[PDB]
Swiss-Prot record, chain D:
This is SAGA-associated factor 29. One of its GO terms (molecular function) is histone H3K36me3 reader activity. Changing residue 127 to A: Slightly reduced H3K4me3 binding. It is found in: Nucleus. The keyword Transcription applies. The lineage of its organism: Eukaryota, Metazoa, Chordata, Craniata, Vertebrata. Changing residue 132 to F: Reduced H3K4me3 binding. It comes from Homo sapiens (Human). The keyword Transcription regulation applies. The record marks 125, 132 as: Histone H3K4me3 binding. The gene is SGF29. Residues 151-153 are annotated as: Histone H3K4me3 binding. Belongs to the SGF29 family. Interacts with dimethylated and trimethylated 'Lys-4' of histone H3 (H3K4me2 and H3K4me3), with a preference for the trimethylated form (H3K4me3). Component of some SAGA-type complexes. Component of the ADA2A-containing complex (ATAC), composed of KAT14, KAT2A, TADA2L, TADA3L, ZZ3, MBIP, WDR5, YEATS2, CCDC101 and DR1. Interacts with (methylated) CGAS. Interacts with TADA3L, GCN5L2, SUPT3H and MYC. Changing residue 66 to A: Does not strongly affect binding to H3K4me. Chromatin reader component of some histone acetyltransferase (HAT) SAGA-type complexes like the TFTC-HAT, ATAC or STAGA complexes. SGF29 specifically recognizes and binds methylated 'Lys-4' of histone H3 (H3K4me), with a preference for trimethylated form (H3K4me3). In the SAGA-type complexes, SGF29 is required to recruit complexes to H3K4me. Involved in the response to endoplasmic reticulum (ER) stress by recruiting the SAGA complex to H3K4me, thereby promoting histone H3 acetylation and cell survival.
Amino acid sequence: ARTKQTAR
Amino acid sequence: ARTK
Amino acid sequence: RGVLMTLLQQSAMTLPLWIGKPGDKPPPLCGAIPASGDYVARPGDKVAARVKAVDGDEQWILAEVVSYSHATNKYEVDDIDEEGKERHTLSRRRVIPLPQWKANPETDPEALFQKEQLVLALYPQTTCFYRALIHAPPQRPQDDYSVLFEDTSYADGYSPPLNVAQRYVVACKEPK
Amino acid sequence: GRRGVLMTLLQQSAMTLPLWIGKPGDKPPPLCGAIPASGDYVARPGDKVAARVKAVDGDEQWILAEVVSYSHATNKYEVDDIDEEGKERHTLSRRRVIPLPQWKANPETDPEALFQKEQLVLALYPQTTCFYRALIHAPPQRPQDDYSVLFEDTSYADGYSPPLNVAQRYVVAC
């Protein structure tokens, strides 16, 4: 999965 | 048909 | 009505992206990739159909294939409005298959029409195709082409940029 | 690469969601837009879901996933992450699986199948494949339109993101 924590 |  | 336009917009939306695999080129009828040379569209497929009115006037319309006869090399197609006497028997050269996939701009930009290309494009809020130039190809999977319709109500001969979905932009088989 | 593959997959699934087209007298079905699943519904292999999964380091996320199986022996699903980097097929209780809608609601014909302004939902956050708590800011006006949502976000002084767009495919009850 791609999380928000990673995205930001 | 529906035209311009 | 508003119902028809909702259906047509959904048809544009639901046209699947071609997800090839890395290293593979996209198939005929992905986006701008032309049909194979002796192609015959299937019943239910969407097409641009060139209808000659009783007075000789020629108009490309959005239609759905009903049948094809090897006996005569003609299609029957139905006007997508499904109103009144909707059916037309047409030669194969009067039928352009619409794309069966959207070209994904990230992976297959080669399968999109490019700026300044002459195309037939469905005019917004209508079921008719008209000559246009590409103004911009899409850059996201969901996005429309931007096109300039030929329009003699403008001194310079073109509309401002108007958005038309991939399902509804095909090769220009019409003289001016 | 992977980032594009993911974003494309997301668009595919959002855009191909069929519109519910009833006739007079018909009501929108379970899993049309905001209409919940029936009681004791079991999702089918291939159906998209929000799946509550715990990583090896304990971090819980609602991830976008696809059903692989459901065992009536144990009342557990198997689901696969839609991301290839998620290499673990997860065994999950029913309470950790929320089916995504299987139809879009047409705001022009079935507005009761849309979430209401200021309802709390789980919504897929842009540039991710995960779902987070959000408030509906505006429902779609036409069938092509996204919801606008305010995500809960502690990086903002008022605790909410600005309005961000999320397709009907990716907004479920919280």
